[PDB]
Amino acid sequence: MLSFQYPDVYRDETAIQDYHGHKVCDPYAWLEDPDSEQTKAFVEAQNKITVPFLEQCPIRGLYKERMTELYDYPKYSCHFKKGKRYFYFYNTGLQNQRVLYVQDSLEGEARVFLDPNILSDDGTVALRGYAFSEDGEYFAYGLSASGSDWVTIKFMKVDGAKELPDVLERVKFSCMAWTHDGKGMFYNAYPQQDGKSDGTETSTNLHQKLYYHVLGTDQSEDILCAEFPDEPKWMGGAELSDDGRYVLLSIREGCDPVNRLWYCDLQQESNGITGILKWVKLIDNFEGEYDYVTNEGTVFTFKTNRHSPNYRLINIDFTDPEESKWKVLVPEHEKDVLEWVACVRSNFLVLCYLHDVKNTLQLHDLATGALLKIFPLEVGSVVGYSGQKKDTEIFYQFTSFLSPGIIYHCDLTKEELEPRVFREVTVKGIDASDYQTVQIFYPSKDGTKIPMFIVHKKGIKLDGSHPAFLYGYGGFNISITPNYSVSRLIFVRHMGGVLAVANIRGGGEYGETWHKGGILANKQNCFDDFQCAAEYLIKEGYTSPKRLTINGGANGGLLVATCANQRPDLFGCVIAQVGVMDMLKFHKYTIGHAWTTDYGCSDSKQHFEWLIKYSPLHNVKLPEADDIQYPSMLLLTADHDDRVVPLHSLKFIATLQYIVGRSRKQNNPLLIHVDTKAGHGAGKPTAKVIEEVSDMFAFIARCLNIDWIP
């Protein structure tokens, strides 16, 4: 099968660094420079062998054709109202980017409001964030090129969709919030830096500032409202209270669900916004999260995890702020996580809970916190919602593994608040009734029961003969909930596969305790949990090692790469997307410094000791047994992935090819594909999404010798 030869890659054997007495060699350190001729030549040489390998078999084209056909279905976001108009996103089916539409009434004819497709031939310019003025007459929107996190904010007058001259640069990881007087907008920006700022650089991002832009002026005139020069990693995001009276500043440092909370009563400013605001430091520490829901005068309602790992709602009165005085509006549930809360129709609260990895949605009274109405949902996830304080209706979007989704609407001015289907689309070609989703809980190494969803064709025999695709993430308090994936369903229908998603520790499925169970000293729990998920699928007869593929992206790329090093005997194929592979140097680049809250940092001897044991780049080793080789591996990254710099995957593949690829027993391929004009994943155009999944499933099919089932 392997008719190709791995490229020559120079090893800098002098690249040695001492980590607390532990000498670490990094022979491919030079791949950290994306601009050198050496690095460019490396990428070219790697793609040169990967592309023909992926395109040789007819299966890639078959998969691509089927994906193009089945993914071609109307895709709508739920409606949301701003001012006197309604807005919604819509993709006719295969447009590179979804389009923002506007209508003057629910019955009115909709018209194109913002079409990102006309900004590029290939759809590599995408919307990244936006904010309407409080009256809905003005609109600010961020644009990112080639998938970079960097944003350029532009503006439009809503009536007539008129482009305005205002342009804001150096924006990244920014908030967008208009003051209610309609004069301007708060946003974040980073100081100037040498070199590039286009997504191909690896420069660390520090000293993020909070600025206020007055509409109709040059960015150079912007007001500096908050800065933290003594704390380079702090990031202060601004939002206006519902009544427009207070600017709330949520300061974050790192990735834990915690934040300082400062406020500024705008009425108390000496003469409007003219400089550093008179911040009142309500919560001046990083011990808990305080997510603004709404306020009534000085009584502020926040969703918090302060001594409540499953989250709860509290009221903090700015006039009697001490913690002993806070009121618990909606107490913490013993097991269900309160995911998010919104205030609508003045005195209603919409609460979304996660019950065993499935969403529930309900309406509560703002004054007492009492449950008023349960909005029934099938097994799945709530992925969209609209309804602000002044609105008198809500829209919410539901999705699941077998259902593309349903958008519901509920008029809250009605006595009996009962929802109605607003929009529903079914994908012709995939009959939901032929498949089933089951949820099981398997014990991990330490006995902890971990949830896992398994999706497969009804009536299959559990004889271990089926190809399986097992996905996991495991970290950053992210919950991996049900979602509709045409690409995965094609694997089920056309490749006879079984899909599985393991809700391993590190995620947010069981609140902050679940998160803490998969970080820092306990990061190994994630890998153990995931390996145990694979062992469950095998023991129960869904699949066998040789037919099992594992996949994950970014922190999930780290997950599958570590699992390949630790248990190469358990997997037949591994697809690691945009993975964090160098755990000793991740903190040095772009926004990597923020991930130390989940991983630790190698500067600390204690942390280094945890990190060195699982870092993918530092644990590539030939399996001892002659009958064991590494699984087939495919790394996917892109040259503008400034979230997880591509050097991670470049150094990792060089190491795999040298240490393992050179061995005579290694017959499974170890490849990388580096895309252009793309980044971490957000905003990737439809055309690229299709090529990507086609590469993935063609790799699986060729390596495992799977025939296409028409």
Ligand SMILES: O=C(NCC(=O)N1CCC[C@H]1C(=O)O)OCc1ccccc1
């Ligand atoms: O870095 C992330 N998110 C985490 C992220 O993208 N990660 C964390 C690990 C690698 C990668 C991933 O898994 O996609 O977002 C940037 C940010 C914004 C505000 C405050 C701090 C940080």
